[PDB]
Amino acid sequence: DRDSCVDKSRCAKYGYYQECQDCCKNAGHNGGTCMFFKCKCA
Description:
Elements: E1 14-15, H1 18-27, E2 32-35, E3 39-41
Antiparallel strand pairs: 1-2, 2-3
């Protein structure tokens, strides 16, 4: 119970990264955003 895509799935400089939004959505949400190589949810 400690997945956290933020510290698992990489990302680009910033914006929309299909990789990030995919992770979150797969976790049990809708998606997320990209923040300085960081993967956050929405």
